[model samples]
Target: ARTITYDVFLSFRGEDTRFNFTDHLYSALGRRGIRTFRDDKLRRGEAIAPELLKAIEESRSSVIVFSENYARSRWCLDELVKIMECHKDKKDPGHAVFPIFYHVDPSHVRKQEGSFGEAFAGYGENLKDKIPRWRTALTEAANLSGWPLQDGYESNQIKEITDSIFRRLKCKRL
Candidate 1:
């Protein structure tokens, strides 16, 4: 049976870093022959495409690009909910999940206060149960060790991210 379909899966809000950081990250991972899963178009509706969830489950690891507008989208929040579930799965020891805080406060992500709170607070609609689960996943993912790059040296940061992922995959030998 197939164990993993992709080496890495990327998660992020499109407008925040789609054309820039995420694309570069994808290319860098590809250059290293680390097969990665990235959804090209950012389409949102009541639920995320089934392919997105399948990709997340199939990948050996994931990198979440947390930004200012990340939490604002319910789709993004749902995406995180799934990612954290995969990360917390005890059966998948090689399932690594990394975070990149791009010009966003880690505190905001953790406590969901400030702009992050404002963004999430706008979820005034239903799915009330999901609200608590979303917050749990958000806070849990935010606490993971990762690169918080707020400065201008994105290339350097990309190198660091890819290098770290490379080391992780090597350790897993997949």
Candidate 2:
């Protein structure tokens, strides 16, 4: 089997925080020679490519850049479920998965309430069931315990998180 030595997989809603956070992180990781896969390659009205599936499976780690409106997207939820399934244990991935909660309370992910909860509720017929799994996946993702991105150091925050992931994964760039 060909083993992949990736530092992180950045997952997020491109419409929400991609401009602010996901893009920044992607740039930082690229500069460090730390390989990362974002869903930007997904074509218009086209399904997710096989490369993304392989990337998520092969990567040593994943980062879910979650926002208040993240759970509203079925694509994000489906991606998250797949990531959670990849881990041996739900909480610890042995440095396989990381969740970056942005501009949202971790509590909302757990409780599945508030605007985040309500939005998820009205999503689909299986809303209740899927939401919990999303919550579980979010909880499992949040359980990775990454560094919080605060009001400042947004640039440095990406670097710091990248360093944290690299150190945890025991990976180095050439």
Candidate 3:
């Protein structure tokens, strides 16, 4: 029964891009007056807490940045699942989930191939209870209309993403 508190919730693998692309994108969103949420907590665990779950639900949408080590993190995958779940929310207009394949291929995310699969190879029964869901979430989130982080200008890419979210939020009306 919550309304949107943040226009965008950022789901990213901090070890990979926290100080760079993700940070730039985060600031870009804020500069545009977009209420955004990025968990700066260094807390590490295989389990996701209710606080993050609440953050996801409170946001109108999520921008998932899939980097090289993204699939290696348990909470990151859980975040993906939660984001996709909200994307299917039965509300009048559901939450949007966006994917940014940063330095990673969409195919890798879709099928959990390449480094994605490599990360899964290390887990055993400890994850059997959740692997299937994580796998599906990875595939599902990847299937959405996605963005790619290639080489142009970093801010330019951020601009497009921020502008897209701006339109999605209908930040203002003409």
Candidate 4:
């Protein structure tokens, strides 16, 4: 009777850390019955499919998994841009973005400094027309509450993170 807003959209660099952590997240969410979307294929030669954009736009929450190499990938950056655009374009602005500081510091990513900054800066130069939009997306994504990669990748930590996400969205855990 009614269209459902996707619970979460997971954005990540497939080559960097998608297989290691993103897939785990996907399966975990599946087990929890959370509606989540992720592009598992690592083929960068192909252009971004329209369905991916639709998923991000229709999602109520987006979790950006930021790794050391995330900003370097154009596709990831493009997806990040679309996510921010969709989030802001909402009538009531019901969308929420969560930045997961995987293997990097939030400060570096937000201020556009350190490795993260350097990577983004270089990419910005190449995509001058898209840089400003990308900058806005990075700033907005950085503002979201994020969890730093800790010493141990324990199940407890995942449960805590997942719980926090679900709580923020006020969605029932399955």
RMSD of candidates 1 onward, in order: 1.6, 3.4, 1.9, 2.9
TM per prediction: 0.93, 0.82, 0.93, 0.86
Q: Write the per-residue lDDT of candidate 1 for residues 20-138, one digit (tens) a residue.
A: 98899889989888999989865657998899989988888889999989998888889899988888872554568899998898999999988789987787767777899889988
| Reference-based lDDT, each prediction | 0.86, 0.71, 0.87, 0.76
- In terms of lDDT, model 4 sits at 0.76
Which residue pairs clash in candidate 4? none
Count of clashing residue pairs in every prediction: 0, 0, 0, 0
Question: Please, what are the lDDT tens digits per residue for candidate 4 over residues 28-114?
Answer: 766666688877653546356677878887787788988888888777888899888867775443667778887788887787778
Angstrom error of the Cα, residue 128, model 3: value is: 0.8
The lDDT ranking, best first, is 3, 1, 4, 2
Candidate 1 has an lDDT of 0.86
